[PDB]
């Protein structure tokens, strides 16, 4: 068992090397030059941010309540890194008995990361804004469970390995046309700062940007696939990375192009408008395997 370390260390580098992508690709959107002075094309800057924040930068806590504040980043980073384990890939590390149920569970527990940070500060000034940030994540998790089930009820069980095999000739974007549009918006609620925005503070960046890649990959399993090929692992590995990278560009697209939707009208897009739409499509997706034979 050495492969676990081969899924944390290159992943922590992927969150680090995001700092290039998150302001150079975002840079050309805004007609500005991103990283250039630090490296040949700014490749030395992502690792330079780590030396700046981890070692030299000291701490000044508000109250430091015994166990908390030095426990919230462990829940933030821990839950973000454990999400990589059930991922199907070409081959998964320790494949669970049911796949997507583990995926929804560790994301619903990832709400605590922003909850314990609100309890860390003694002031009332911070906790009202902290609970508002919880409301952005907690509300969209209702619909996230519904849109997941509609894709599953079309084909395959909860296992993530079966979701690759069902996409043999055509993608799941075409049968789930309005549902694919939902996953572009619903994923951005989890601290992406595109439709709505709120030492150890630096550790939250390493956890929040990790979930951004996680939602990009998870959308490329439920809706993308193209080919499987069990005999050739070479063809799948390259083709999967390009599909995930194109979704990473769309995540940074919303951050630059579109203003914030307001907190009150975030509950008018969802609940008032999205929840009647998602359930109507869920009603449609119950009838689909009954109308025409479609059972795994």
């Amino acid at each position: 068992m050495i492969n676990i370390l081969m899924l944390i260390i290159p992943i922590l580098l992927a969150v680090a090397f995001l700092t290039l992508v998150e302001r150079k690709v975002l840079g050309y959107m805004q007609l500005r030059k991103g990283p250039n002075v630090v490296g040949p094309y700014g490749l030395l800057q992502p690792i330079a941010d780590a030396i700046k924040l981890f070692i030299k930068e000291p701490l000044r806590p508000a109250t430091s309540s015994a166990s908390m504040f030095i426990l919230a980043p462990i829940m933030a980073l821990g839950l973000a890194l454990t999400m990589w384990i059930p991922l199907p890939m070409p081959y998964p590390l320790i494949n669970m008995n049911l796949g997507v149920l583990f995926m929804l569970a560790m994301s619903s527990l990832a709400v605590y990361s922003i909850l314990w940070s609100g309890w860390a500060s003694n002031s009332k000034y911070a906790l009202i804004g902290a609970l508002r940030a919880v409301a952005q994540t907690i509300s969209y998790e209702v619909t996230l469970a519904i849109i997941l089930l509609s894709v599953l009820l079309m084909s395959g069980s909860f296992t993530l390995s079966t979701l690759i095999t069902t996409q043999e000739q055509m993608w799941l974007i075409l049968p789930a046309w309005p549902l694919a549009m939902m996953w572009f918006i619903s994923t951005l609620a989890e601290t992406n700062r595109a439709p709505f925005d709120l030492g150890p503070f630096a550790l939250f960046f390493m956890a929040e940007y990790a979930n951004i890649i996680m939602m990009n990959i998870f959308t490329a399993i439920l809706f993308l696939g193209t080919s499987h090929n069990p005999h050739m692992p070479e063809l799948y590995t390259i083709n999967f990375t390009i599909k995930s990278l194109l979704l990473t560009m769309s995540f940074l697209w919303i951050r630059a192009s579109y203003p914030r939707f307001r907190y009150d009208q975030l509950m008018h897009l969802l609940w008032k408008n999205f929840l009647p739409l998602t359930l109507a499509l869920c009603m449609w997706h119950v009838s689909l395997p009954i109308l025409t034979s479609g059972i795994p």
Binding site: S65, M68, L101, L104, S107, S108, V111, L115, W119, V134
Partner: protein
């Protein structure tokens, strides 16, 4: 190494001590994450793929998250250390000693119990299940079905209609 479930059952009780004792709803709330997450392993080891993960989805990622709101809505009082308080440390030490004294009696197999049932060893007999089923295996492998139990679906739907209507009327 020998036991799998028995070690997790001790940690299950360990998290539960902060409930008979009163360590405030902040630290007392933290107990349900510790006891819940380890409590899944007790369920999962004997089987149940769906039912084992339901604790993570509802009890851990739904139940206590709503309880996270109420701690801020009512009685926040800025979180305090649960060691300086009187009788709280006394309830915690007596709570663990009721179970940890029984742990010492596990050695040499037989242990004294208040109940009539004996404990013995039960390591290989802890699971007490054969292979039996193969394809579409386990009783919990097909745990929930809308068929046969049609009456249960109606009343559960009825009760969840009550909750939304009632709580809106109180406020």
């Amino acid at each position: 190494m020998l036991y799998i479930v028995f070690i997790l059952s001790v940690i299950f009780v360990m998290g539960f001590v902060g409930f008979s004792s009163k360590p405030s709803p902040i630290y007392g709330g933290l107990g349900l994450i510790v006891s819940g997450g380890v409590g899944c392993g007790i369920v999962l080891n004997f089987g149940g793929s769906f039912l084992g993960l339901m604790v993570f989805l509802i009890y851990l990622g739904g139940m206590m998250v709503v309880f996270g709101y109420t701690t801020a809505m009512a009685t926040e009082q800025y979180p305090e250390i649960w060691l300086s308080n009187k009788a709280v440390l006394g309830a915690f030490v007596t709570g663990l000693l009721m179970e940890f004294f029984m742990v010492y009696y596990v050695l040499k197999d037989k242990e004294v119990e208040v109940v009539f049932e004996f404990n013995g060893l039960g390591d290989w007999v802890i699971y007490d299940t054969g292979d039996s089923g193969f394809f579409s295996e386990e009783a919990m492998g097909i745990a929930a079905l809308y068929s046969y139990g049609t009456w249960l679906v109606i009343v559960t739907g009825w009760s969840l209609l009550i909750g939304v209507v009632v709580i809106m009327e109180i406020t």
